[PDB]
Amino acid sequence: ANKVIQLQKIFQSSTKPLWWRHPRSALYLYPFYAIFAVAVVTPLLYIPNAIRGIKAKKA
Amino acid sequence: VHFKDGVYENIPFKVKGRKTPYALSHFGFFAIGFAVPFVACYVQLKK
Amino acid sequence: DEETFEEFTARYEKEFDEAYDLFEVQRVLNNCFSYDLVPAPAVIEKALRAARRVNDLPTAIRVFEALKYKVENEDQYKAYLDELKDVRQELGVPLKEELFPS
Amino acid sequence: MVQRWLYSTNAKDIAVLYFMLAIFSGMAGTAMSLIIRLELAAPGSQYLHGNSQLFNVLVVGHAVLMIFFLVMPALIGGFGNYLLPLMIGATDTAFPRINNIAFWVLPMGLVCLVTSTLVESGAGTGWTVYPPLSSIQAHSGPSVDLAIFALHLTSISSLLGAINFIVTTLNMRTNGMTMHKLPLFVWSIFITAFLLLLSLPVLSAGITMLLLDRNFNTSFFEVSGGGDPILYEHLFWFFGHPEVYILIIPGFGIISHVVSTYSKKPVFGEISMVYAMASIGLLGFLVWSHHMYIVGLDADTRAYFTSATMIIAIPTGIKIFSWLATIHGGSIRLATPMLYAIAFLFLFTMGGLTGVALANASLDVAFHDTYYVVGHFHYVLSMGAIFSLFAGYYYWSPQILGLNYNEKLAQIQFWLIFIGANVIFFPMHFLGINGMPRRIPDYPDAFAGWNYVASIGSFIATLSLFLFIYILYDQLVNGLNNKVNNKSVIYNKAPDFVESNTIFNLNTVKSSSIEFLLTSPPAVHSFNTPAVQS
Amino acid sequence: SPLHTVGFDARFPQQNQTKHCWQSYVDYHKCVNMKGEDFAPCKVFWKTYNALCPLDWIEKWDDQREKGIFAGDINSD
Amino acid sequence: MTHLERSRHQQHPFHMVMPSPWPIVVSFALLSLALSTALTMHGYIGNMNMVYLALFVLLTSSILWFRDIVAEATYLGDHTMAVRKGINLGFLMFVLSEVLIFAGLFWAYFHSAMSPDVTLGACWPPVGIEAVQPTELPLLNTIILLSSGATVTYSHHALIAGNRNKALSGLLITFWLIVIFVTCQYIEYTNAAFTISDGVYGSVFYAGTGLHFLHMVMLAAMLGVNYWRMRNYHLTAGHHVGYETTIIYTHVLDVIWLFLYVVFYWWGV
Amino acid sequence: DVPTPYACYFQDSATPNQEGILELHDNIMFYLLVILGLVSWMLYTIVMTYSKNPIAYKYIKHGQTIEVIWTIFPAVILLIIAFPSFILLYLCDEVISPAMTIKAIGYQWYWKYEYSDFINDSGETVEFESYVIPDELLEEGQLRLLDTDTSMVVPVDTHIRFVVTAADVIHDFAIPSLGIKVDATPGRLNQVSALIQREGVFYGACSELCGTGHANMPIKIEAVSLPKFLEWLNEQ
Amino acid sequence: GRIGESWVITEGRRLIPEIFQWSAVLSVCLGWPGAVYFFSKARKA
Amino acid sequence: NKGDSSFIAKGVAAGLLFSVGLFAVVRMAGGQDAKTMNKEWQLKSDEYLKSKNANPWGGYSQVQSK
Amino acid sequence: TIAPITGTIKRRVIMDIVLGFSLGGVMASYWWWGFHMDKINKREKFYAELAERKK
Numbered sequence A: 001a002n003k004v005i006q007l008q009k010i011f012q013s014s015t016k017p018l019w020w021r022h023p024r025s026a027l028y029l030y031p032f033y034a035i036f037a038v039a040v041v042t043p044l045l046y047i048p049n050a051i052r053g054i055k056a057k058k059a
Numbered sequence B: 001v002h003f004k005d006g007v008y009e010n011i012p013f014k015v016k017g018r019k020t021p022y023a024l025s026h027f028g029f030f031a032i033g034f035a036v037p038f039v040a041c042y043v044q045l046k047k
Numbered sequence C: 001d002e003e004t005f006e007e008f009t010a011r012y013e014k015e016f017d018e019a020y021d022l023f024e025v026q027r028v029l030n031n032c033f034s035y036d037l038v039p040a041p042a043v044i045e046k047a048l049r050a051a052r053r054v055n056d057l058p059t060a061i062r063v064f065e066a067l068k069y070k071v072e073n074e075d076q077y078k079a080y081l082d083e084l085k086d087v088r089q090e091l092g093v094p095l096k097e098e099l100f101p102s
Numbered sequence D: 001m002v003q004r005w006l007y008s009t010n011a012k013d014i015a016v017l018y019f020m021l022a023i024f025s026g027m028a029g030t031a032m033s034l035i036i037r038l039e040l041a042a043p044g045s046q047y048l049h050g051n052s053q054l055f056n057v058l059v060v061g062h063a064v065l066m067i068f069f070l071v072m073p074a075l076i077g078g079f080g081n082y083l084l085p086l087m088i089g090a091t092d093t094a095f096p097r098i099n100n101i102a103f104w105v106l107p108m109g110l111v112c113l114v115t116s117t118l119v120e121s122g123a124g125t126g127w128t129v130y131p132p133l134s135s136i137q138a139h140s141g142p143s144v145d146l147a148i149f150a151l152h153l154t155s156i157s158s159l160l161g162a163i164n165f166i167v168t169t170l171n172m173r174t175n176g177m178t179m180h181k182l183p184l185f186v187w188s189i190f191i192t193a194f195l196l197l198l199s200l201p202v203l204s205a206g207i208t209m210l211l212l213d214r215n216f217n218t219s220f221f222e223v224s225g226g227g228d229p230i231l232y233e234h235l236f237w238f239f240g241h242p243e244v245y246i247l248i249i250p251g252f253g254i255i256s257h258v259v260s261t262y263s264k265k266p267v268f269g270e271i272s273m274v275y276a277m278a279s280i281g282l283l284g285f286l287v288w289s290h291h292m293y294i295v296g297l298d299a300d301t302r303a304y305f306t307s308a309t310m311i312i313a314i315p316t317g318i319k320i321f322s323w324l325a326t327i328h329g330g331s332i333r334l335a336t337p338m339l340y341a342i343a344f345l346f347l348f349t350m351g352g353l354t355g356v357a358l359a360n361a362s363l364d365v366a367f368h369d370t371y372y373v374v375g376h377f378h379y380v381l382s383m384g385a386i387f388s389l390f391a392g393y394y395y396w397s398p399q400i401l402g403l404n405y406n407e408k409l410a411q412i413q414f415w416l417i418f419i420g421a422n423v424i425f426f427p428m429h430f431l432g433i434n435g436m437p438r439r440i441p442d443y444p445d446a447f448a449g450w451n452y453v454a455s456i457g458s459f460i461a462t463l464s465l466f467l468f469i470y471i472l473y474d475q476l477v478n479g480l481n482n483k484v485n486n487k488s489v490i491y492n493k494a495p496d497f498v499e500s501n502t503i504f505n506l507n508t509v510k511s512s513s514i515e516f517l518l519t520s521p522p523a524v525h526s527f528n529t530p531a532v533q534s
Numbered sequence E: 001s002p003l004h005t006v007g008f009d010a011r012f013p014q015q016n017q018t019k020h021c022w023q024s025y026v027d028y029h030k031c032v033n034m035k036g037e038d039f040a041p042c043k044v045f046w047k048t049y050n051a052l053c054p055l056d057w058i059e060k061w062d063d064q065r066e067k068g069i070f071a072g073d074i075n076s077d
Numbered sequence F: 001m002t003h004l005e006r007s008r009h010q011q012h013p014f015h016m017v018m019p020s021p022w023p024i025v026v027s028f029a030l031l032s033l034a035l036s037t038a039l040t041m042h043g044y045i046g047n048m049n050m051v052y053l054a055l056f057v058l059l060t061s062s063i064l065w066f067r068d069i070v071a072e073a074t075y076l077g078d079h080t081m082a083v084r085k086g087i088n089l090g091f092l093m094f095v096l097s098e099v100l101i102f103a104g105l106f107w108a109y110f111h112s113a114m115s116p117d118v119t120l121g122a123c124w125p126p127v128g129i130e131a132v133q134p135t136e137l138p139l140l141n142t143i144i145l146l147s148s149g150a151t152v153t154y155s156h157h158a159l160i161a162g163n164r165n166k167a168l169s170g171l172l173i174t175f176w177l178i179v180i181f182v183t184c185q186y187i188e189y190t191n192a193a194f195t196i197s198d199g200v201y202g203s204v205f206y207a208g209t210g211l212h213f214l215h216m217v218m219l220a221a222m223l224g225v226n227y228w229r230m231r232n233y234h235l236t237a238g239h240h241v242g243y244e245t246t247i248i249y250t251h252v253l254d255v256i257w258l259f260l261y262v263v264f265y266w267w268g269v
Numbered sequence G: 001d002v003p004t005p006y007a008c009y010f011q012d013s014a015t016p017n018q019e020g021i022l023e024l025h026d027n028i029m030f031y032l033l034v035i036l037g038l039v040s041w042m043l044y045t046i047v048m049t050y051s052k053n054p055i056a057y058k059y060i061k062h063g064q065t066i067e068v069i070w071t072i073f074p075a076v077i078l079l080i081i082a083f084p085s086f087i088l089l090y091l092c093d094e095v096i097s098p099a100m101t102i103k104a105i106g107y108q109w110y111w112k113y114e115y116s117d118f119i120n121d122s123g124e125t126v127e128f129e130s131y132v133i134p135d136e137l138l139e140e141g142q143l144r145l146l147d148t149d150t151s152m153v154v155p156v157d158t159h160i161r162f163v164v165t166a167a168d169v170i171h172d173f174a175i176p177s178l179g180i181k182v183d184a185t186p187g188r189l190n191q192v193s194a195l196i197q198r199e200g201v202f203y204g205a206c207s208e209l210c211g212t213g214h215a216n217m218p219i220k221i222e223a224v225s226l227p228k229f230l231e232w233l234n235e236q
Numbered sequence H: 001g002r003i004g005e006s007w008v009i010t011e012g013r014r015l016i017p018e019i020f021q022w023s024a025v026l027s028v029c030l031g032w033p034g035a036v037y038f039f040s041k042a043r044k045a
Numbered sequence I: 001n002k003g004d005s006s007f008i009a010k011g012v013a014a015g016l017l018f019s020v021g022l023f024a025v026v027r028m029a030g031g032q033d034a035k036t037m038n039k040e041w042q043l044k045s046d047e048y049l050k051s052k053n054a055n056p057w058g059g060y061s062q063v064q065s066k
Numbered sequence J: 001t002i003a004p005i006t007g008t009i010k011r012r013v014i015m016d017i018v019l020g021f022s023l024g025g026v027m028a029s030y031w032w033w034g035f036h037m038d039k040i041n042k043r044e045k046f047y048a049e050l051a052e053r054k055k
C-alpha cells in the first residue's frame, strides 16, 4: 500500500516513545501489558507451594 | 538520550539527597546478599 | 635500528640545541636519561645550556641529581662533576647535596 | 529514573548494573563458601546436622554463583561494557538492546538458582551436573531443572554479550585504530568473546540433553536405554576448559594494563601478548579431556591429551614472563592495583605449576577428585580472577565513579585477602596429596588439622571482603573528601625524575588508553567527534 | 587352582572391557546352539565371561535370553 | 554542506538506540517460561496452559522487538552502511552459534554410533528399530530444500535488478516450499516406527532432526515477514538486511540438512 | 596405607604403580621448583630494586633475543617432564597375564566385591557387600569413616585385575596407597592392574559424588599372604 | 675506562642482602604451615 | 605518607586477631566433637595399625588430639 | 675523559637470570637429593629388611 513515506513523516514528527508512534500502537500494547502482567505474576505465585511440597491436585 | 551526568548521576541508588542514611541501604543490600544462603540452609534444615 | 653511542650523542646535542621552551627541555631530558646509558658530558653540557636558555634553574640541578641516580658508581659521579666543573661554575648551579647540606 | 536503568540502552549503565549483580551474587557465593568451610573445620557434623545433601547443594551454589554470577558478570559484563566501547572510542556498542537483554536475563538466572535451592531437595550434583546422579532416578523433584535453567539463562547472557563484543570491536573502532593498534584488554575481551561464542553451544547441547533425559523419558545418558554418561563428560568439558580460559583471559587483559601503568613503561612485546592470548584461546578447545583421565580413555588418547595440555604452558609462560619484563626496569608506584598485579603474578604462577603437575595423565591417577585439584583451581580462579577483579576495581573506579577510595584501607584489605587466601588454599594441596577425596562433608579424622587451618583462613578472607564492602561505602560517601585530603592517591602516575610540578599539572594524565582522559564520571554520550589516532 | 585367570586378550587391549565380557557371553551362548560338539572349549568362554561380567549383568542377560529380549547375535538355526 | 548544517547530525555512523523496554520484557517472559515449565514438568501446576501463556508472552515480546527494529530501519532510517555491516556480521555470528549446536548433536550421534553399546546389540541401528529409509520421503525433502535455495537466490537477484513481480513470486514460492518441508517432516514424524524414548537412536535422531525442524519453522516465520515487508515496499534495491539475513539463514539450514540427511540416513542405515 | 594427621606427602607405596607415580611427581616437582624459584626471585628482585627507581627505562619494548629464549625454554622443560610421563603411562597401561581378577562393583553408597574366578564350596562365586561401620557401632579403636564392615582381602606379590563398574551413578574406585583410581560409569567395565608388594591394610573411598552417602563409602583392601588368603577364601 | 669499583663488587653488595631477604620471604610464604605443625599436638608437644 | 606503613601493618594485625576471635566464637557455637577425637581412642587406632604394620616407612600414628 | 658507560641493565638482567636459575636449582637440588632421596632410601631399606625376613 506504500505507507512508507507517510509513516516516515509520522514517526520522525513525534515526541512519543518508538513503540507508541504508530496509530495502531495501543491496539497491540494494552492487551500485551495485561497478558504480560498475568504471565509473570502467576508462576512467581506458584513458588510457595513448590517449596512447601504441595503438588497440584489432579481434579 | 540526554540524561543527567556528574558525580552521583552515574549510579542507580541515591546517596546524597536522602531521608534515611545511605549506610542503611548500602549494608542492607550486602546483608541480604550474605543472608540468602542462611535462608536456604534454614529451609533445607526445617525439611 | 639500534643507535651507537656517538649517534646518540649527536642526536641529543641536536635535540637540546633545537629545544625552545621549558616543556621541551624537560621532555628532551626525560627521554635523554631514560635509556640504558649515562649520556656523554657534551650532552649534559648542552642540557645545562638549554636549561639556561629557557631561564630555569632547578632542572639544571636535576641534571646532576638524575646523573647521580643514573650512574653506577660513586666515582663516576665524581668523574662527571669534575669534568663539568667549569660549565657548572659558569652557569652557577649547585649540586643538590651542597644545596641542602645534611 | 525508570528509563535510564530499566529501559537502558547505553553501555555504562548496563555495566554498573552488571557489576552490582556480580558483587551481590559474589557476596552470596562467599557466604556459601564460608558455610562450606565452617562445616569442614572439624570431623563430624558440626553445623549442618548430618544433611550431606545440603552441603552438596551449597557446594553447587557456591561454585555456580562464584563462576557464572560473580566473575563472568563482573569481568565480562561490567568491565567489557564500560571499557570496550571506551577504550576503542566507540560511541555506544552495536546492538545495545542485546546488551540490555543479556544483563536482564542474568538475575532471573539467579532467581531460579535460588528457587532451585529452595524447592523440594536442592541440586546436590556438583557444579558439573554429571548423570545418572543428576538424572531423575537419583534426583527427583524440579530442582536440577531450575539449576539447568539458571545455566541456560546465563548461557544466553554470555553468548549474546559475546556477539555484541565481537561486532563492537570489529565494526565500531575509531578512525585511527587498526586491529594491531588495539589495547590488550580489548584484545582480551575479543578473544574471550570468541571462546564464549564457540563454547556455549556445546554446553547448551549437553545441558538440554540432560533436561530431555530428566523430563521427556529419552536416553542420551541412561544406561538402561543404551545411553552413555561419558557423552555428558565430553560435552560438558568441551565447554568447561574453554570456560576456565574465558574466566582467566580478561585477567590477562587487566594485568597488562595495571602493570604497564604502574611501571611507567609499555608492555614488553605487546603483539606477542596478542599472539599468546590468541594461542591460549585456540589451544583451550583441544585439551578438554584432561578433566577425565579416569574414565578409561585409551593410552594414546591420554598420551595426546597430556601433551596438548602441556603445550599451553608455553604461551602462558610467555605472558607471565613479558609481565616480568614490563615490571623490570620501570619505576614501580606500588598502589593497590600494582599490589594485586604482583600477587596475581606469583600466585597464578603457583597455581599454573600445580596445573602442569596435574596435566600428566599418569599423575592424575593420583590426584583426580582430591583436594589437590581444588588447590590448583582455587589458586588460578581465586587469585587470577579475584585479584584481577580487585585490580580492575581499584584501577578504574576513581575514573568511572569520580570518587576516590581510602588507600590505607585498600592496602590492609589487599594484605588480609592475600594471607587469608594463601592460608585457605595452601593446605588443600597437602590434603589432596595425602588422599582426601573431593566433595565430602566429612572425612577420616586424619585430615582435621589442615581442614582446621584452612577453616581459620576462611574467616580472614571473609573479613577482607567485609572490609572491601566498607571501602565501597567509604568511597561512595566520602569520595570528594578523599580527593581533597591526603587519604587517597589522586595521580596514578607520578612525575618523571626531571619533570616539574607545573609542567606535570598541564599534562596530568599520561596514558596509552582513552579511558583516563575522559572526565570523571564520563559523559552519558561521549565521543561526539570521533577520537582520532595516528 | 593357585591363581589362574583369563589373561591378555589382544582383541580388547585397552582399558574398558565391556565388549570383552559381552562378546564372551554371546560366544558362550553361540557355542551351545550352533556347534555343541566341544563342551570343554565351550567352557573357555564360560570362564572368561564368568570372570569378566558382573553377576547382575549375567542375571539380566539370562532373563533377557529366556524372555527373548536379548539383543545379541543369537541364531538358534 | 556548511558547518552549521553539519553540526546538526550524528558525526559517527553507528545507531544511537532509544531506550526500549523489550530487553527486560523478554527477560521477564523467559524467566516465567523457565519457572512455569519447571513447575509443570513435576506436577506443581496442574495443566500446560501456564507454559502456553509464557510462550505466548515471549513470542509477542520478541515480535514487538522486531517491530521496533523494522521501524528504526525503515521509518527512522538509522541503519546506515556501518550499522548494516554490523548487523550482517552479528547475524553471521549467531548463525555460527547454531551451527556449533548442531555440531554438538552430531557429536552425540557419532559417539553413540561409533561406540555401539552392548545393551543395544553392538550394531547401528539397534535390533528391533527399523530405520527411516533415505530414498522415500527425505529425498523429496532434500530436493525441495535445494530448490528453496535456488528460489531464494533467484528472488534476491530479481530484487536487486528491480523486478518486483519476479522477486515477490520467488519469495512466495520458496516460502511455500519450506512449509512443504515442514509438512513432510511432520508427516514423517507421524508415520514413523520408533519413538523419542526408543533408546539412543530415537533420542539423537529426533533431537537432531527436530532441532533442524525448529530452525525451519523459524525460517518460515522469517520468509513470511520478509514477504510482507517486500509486499509493503519496505525493501529497497540496495538497502535490505532482512532479506540477506534470511537467505544466508536459508543456505546454512540447507547445508545443515544436507549433512543431516547424508549422516543420519545414508550412514545410519 | 592410612592417612596421617598433618601430612604433606603421599601415603606409603605398596605397588610399582604408586611408587612410579611418586617418582614421576618428584621428577616434576624438581623442575617446577626451578621455575618457581626463577619467578619468585625475579619478582622479588624486581620489586625491591625498582620500587625506588626514579627514571623508568621506557624504551625497552621488543627484545627479540629473550623472546625466543623464553619461548624455547618451556619447550625443553615440558619435553623433559614429558619423557618419563610417557614411559610411566605406557608402562602402567600394560596388563601382562594377571594371576587374579576381582570385580568391585559400586552400588549406591556401598561396594560389592566379587571374586568370580574362585570357589566357595565347589566352583560357585564369592561375593560380599562392604558397608561402612556406622558411627554408633564403632568399638574403641576403629578409624571413623574408614573402617568398613567386610574388607576385601587380597593375596600379596600377585597380579590383580580390578574390573570396576557401577549400578546406579558414577562411583570411583580409588585406593591411593595402591595407586589405583578408576571410576565406575554404570555403562561399561573398566579394568586396572596392580600387584601388592607387602602385607597390610590399605584404605580408600569413592572419589566421585554419589549423592548423600558419598562421604561414608570407604574401601578397605587387606593384603594378606597366600596361604592365609586361601584359608580365608575356603572359609568364605 | 672502568672508572670506580668493579661491577662484580657493586652488584654483589646489592645482591647478597637480596638473596637472604628473598630466602626469608619465600620461606615464610611457603613454610608457614611448619609453625602450625610445630606447635601442634601431632608432634606430641 | 610517613605513618601509613605502620597503620597498614597494625591494620592487618588487627584483622588477623579479629578474624581468629570470630572463629573462636562461632567455633564455640558449634556441634559436639566426634567420639573418635580422643587420645585414648587414637592410641587404640595406632595399636590396630601397628598390628597390621601399616605405613611402614612413613608415619602411621594418628594421635593429633587431647 | 669519561669512557662511554653503557648497558648496565643488560648485565643486570643476565646476572639476575642466572642467579634466579641457580637459586631455584639450589631449592630443587635440596628437594630431590634430600627429600626424595630420603624417602626412597627409607623405602629401599624397608624392602631390604622385608626380603631378609622372608629368607
Ligand code: HEA
Residues within 6 Å of the ligand: D022, D023, D026, D027, D030, D033, D034, D036, D037, D059, D060, D062, D063, D064, D066, D067, D070, D071, D074, D125, D126, D127, D128, D374, D378, D381, D382, D385, D386, D389, D390, D393, D421, D424, D438, D439, D440, D458, D461, D462, D464, D465
Ligand atoms: C570463581 C571461582 C571461585 C572462587 C573465587 C572460589 C573461592 C572460595 N571457595 Fe570455592 N569452588 C569453586 C569456585 C570458586 N571458589 C568451584 C568451581 C568449586 C567446585 C564445586 C565442585 O567441585 O562440585 C568450588 C568448591 C569449593 C570447595 C571444595 C569443597 C569440596 O568440593 O569438597 C571449597 C573448600 O573450602 C570452597 C570454598 C571457597 C572459599 C573459602 C573461597 C574464598 O576464596 C572466598 C574468598 C573470596 C572472596 C572474598 C572474593 C571477593 C568477593 C567478591 C564479591 C569480589 C569483589 C570484587 C569485585 C566485585 C571487583 N569452594
Ligand code: HEA
Residues within 6 Å of the ligand: D128, D244, D245, D247, D248, D290, D291, D292, D309, D310, D312, D313, D314, D316, D317, D318, D320, D348, D349, D351, D352, D353, D355, D356, D358, D359, D360, D364, D367, D368, D369, D373, D376, D377, D380, D381, D384, G035, G039, G073, G074, G077, G078
Ligand atoms: C582460572 C581458570 C583455570 C586456569 C587458567 C587453569 C589452568 C590450567 N589447568 Fe586447570 N582447572 C580449573 C581451572 C583453571 N585451570 C578448574 C575450575 C578445575 C576443576 C574442574 C572440576 O573439577 O570441576 C581445573 C582442573 C584441572 C585439571 C583436571 C584434573 C582433574 O579433574 O582430575 C587439569 C588437568 O590437566 C588442569 C591443568 C591445568 C593446566 C596445565 C593449566 C595451565 O593453563 C596453566 C598455565 C600456567 C603456567 C604453566 C604457569 C605460568 C608459566 C610459567 C611460570 C612458565 C614456566 C612453566 C613451565 C616451563 C611449565 N586443571
Ligand SMILES: CCCCCCCCCCCCCCCC(=O)OC[C@H](COP(=O)(O)OCCN)OC(=O)CCCCCCCCCCCCCCC
Residues within 6 Å of the ligand: B011, B012, B013, B014, B017, B018, B019, B020, B024, B025, B026, B028, B029, B030, D015, D016, D019, D020, D078, D079, D082, D397, D400, D401, D472
Ligand atoms: C533497601 C532499603 C531502602 C529504603 C528506602 C526508603 C525510602 C524512603 C526515602 C529514602 C530516600 C529514597 C531512597 C531510595 C533510593 C535507594 O535507596 O535506592 C534503592 C535501591 C533498590 O531499591 P528497591 O527497589 O529495593 O526499593 C524498594 C522501594 N522502591 O537500593 C540499592 O540499589 C542498594 C544498592 C547498594 C549499593 C551497591 C554498591 C556497589 C556499587 C558499585 C558501583 C560502581 C561500579 C564500578 C564498576 C563498573
Ligand SMILES: CCCCCCCCCCCCCCCC(=O)OC[C@H](COP(=O)(O)OCCN)OC(=O)CCCCCCCCCCCCCCC
Residues within 6 Å of the ligand: C002, D321, D324, D325, D328, G042, G060, G062, G063, G064, G065, G066, G069, G070, G073, J009, J010, J013, J014, J017, J018, J021, J022
Ligand atoms: C632460560 C632463560 C630465560 C628464562 C626466562 C627469562 C626470565 C624471566 C624474567 C625476565 C626479566 C628480564 C626481561 C627484560 C630484559 C630485557 O628486555 O632486555 C632487553 C635487552 C636489549 O639488548 P640490546 O640493547 O643489546 O639489543 C637491542 C635489540 N634487541 O636484551 C637483553 O637484555 C639480552 C639478555 C640476554 C639474556 C640471556 C640469558 C642467559 C642465561 C640463560 C639461562 C642460564 C641458566 C644457567 C644456570 C646455571
Ligand SMILES: CCCCCCCCCCCCCCCC(=O)OC[C@H](COP(=O)(O)OCCN)OC(=O)CCCCCCCCCCCCCCC
Residues within 6 Å of the ligand: D334, D339, D342, D343, D346, D415, D418, D419, D422, D423, G040, G041, G043, G044, G047, H025, H026, H028, H029, H032, I001, I002, I003, I004, I005, I006, I008, I009, I012
Ligand atoms: C601467610 C603466607 C603469606 C605471608 C606473607 C608475608 C608475611 C607478612 C604479611 C604482611 C605484613 C604487613 C606488612 C605491611 C608492609 C607495609 O607496611 O608496607 C610499607 C612499604 C614501605 O613503605 P615506604 O618504604 O614508602 O616507607 C614507609 C615508612 N615511612 O611499602 C610497601 O607496601 C612495599 C612492600 C610490599 C611489596 C609488594 C608485595 C606485593 C605482594 C607480593 C606477593 C609475594 C611476592 C614475593 C614472593 C617471594
Ligand SMILES: [Ca+2]
Residues within 6 Å of the ligand: D039, D040, D041, D042, D043, D044, D045, D046, D441, D442, D443
Ligand atoms: Ca566436618
Ligand SMILES: [Cu+2]
Residues within 6 Å of the ligand: D240, D241, D244, D290, D291
Ligand atoms: Cu581444564
Ligand SMILES: [Mg+2]
Residues within 6 Å of the ligand: D368, D369, G207, G208
Ligand atoms: Mg571425578
